[PDB]
């Protein structure tokens, strides 16, 4: 639901 | 009917290859784990694709995700199959994985990361030596994919990715690419307006690899003369008028005559009569450092109405223009 086209959104190494 | 035509080189590569090679409709796609990839930032958008910068979390490596749209489906298999066939070829983008959203069923291609630098962005600063170097690198990709029985059909600066600090180039976006079968009458609604060959414009359907060599000549002209784009037509009809105003109408009508082409009646009143304008006429103070008699000879040998008369990718590689590229 904060997933875009099934992909989670990355934040930061 | 129109006179038949066969590619002068790599004619029967698909003919002597098994159907598993070129029969993309039968290709069973091996789907990977979508959970391995996470979106980093937006890279661009097209008319059927959404491109993103991403990270594979299993190894923390940068990748590029291209989410496909449902607008044009069953054409996803042709792209997938062509990328897998070309995998490992010189300067061909590496398809690293294929993933699918379990809920929306929307597929995504995961590519090797390359610096998000289009050719357009660099040409404005490239010197004569780097134009030759990168043009040769593009020719390696085109000779490879043609040798593998594939026409890219969308050669343009946007589809060339360059990492200048590593002088590394990749030919991308194989979404319009197709398998060459000698005798096939293809759809002429391919490539991008400014890069369409005369064959597309006159609806000559039995084209081949040489279509890519016209598109490449369009890019060379744009780079050496600093004119973006070189042929600026307002539509497919005017695009041929813009070509005619440079190459001339005489050679256009000789081309149509040679291939027994049925010229659309609209062309009778818009094509007119135009003499051939010498390549040297496009040379001025701002671009004379990028022009040479070799650049001009080479350009003249690519931008030819007759697709059969254009250099092949391997013949272009042997032209004196590339003598300065030290291997
Ligand atoms: C469900 N969901 C997640 C997000 C979202 C949006 C942003 C943004 O910048 O707009 C960023 C992130 C994010 C960044 N990092 C390091 N982890 N998550 C997530 N929108 N909706």
Author numbering:
A (entry chain B): 2 to 14
B (entry chain A): 3 to 329
Passage from the reporting paper:
Among the strategies designed to target CK2 outside its orthosteric binding site, is the inhibition of the PPI between the α and the β subunits. Disruption of the holoenzyme assembly affects the function of CK2 by preventing phosphorylation of β-dependent substrates, the shuttling of the protein between different intracellular compartments, and by reducing the stability of the catalytic α subunit.30–33 With the exception of the Phe pocket, the CK2α/β interface is a shallow and hydrophobic surface; consequently, peptides are an ideal class of molecule to target this PPI. In order to design stable peptides targeting the CK2α/β interaction, we used a rational-design approach based on the valuable crystal structures of CK2β and the disulfide bridged Pc peptide.
Peptide P1-C4 was the most effective macrocyclised peptide at displacing the FP probe from the CK2α subunit (93 ± 1% inhibition at 15 μM). This suggested that constraint C4 was optimal at constraining the peptide in its binding conformation. The binding affinity of P1-C4 and P1-C5 for the CK2α subunit was measured via isothermal titration calorimetry (ITC). P1-C4 showed the highest affinity with a Kd of 460 nM, showing a modest increase compared to Pc (1000 nM, ESI Table S3†). The crystal structure showed the peptide binding in a conformation that overlays well with CK2β and Pc. The backbone residues of P1-C4 are all slightly shifted compared to Pc; however, these differences are greatest closer to the constraint that holds the two ends of the peptide further apart than the disulfide linker does; consequently, the terminal residues adopt entirely different conformations. The X-ray crystal structure of P1-C4 shows Ile9 oriented in the right direction to be replaced by an amino acid capable of π–π stacking with the benzene ring of the C4 constraint.
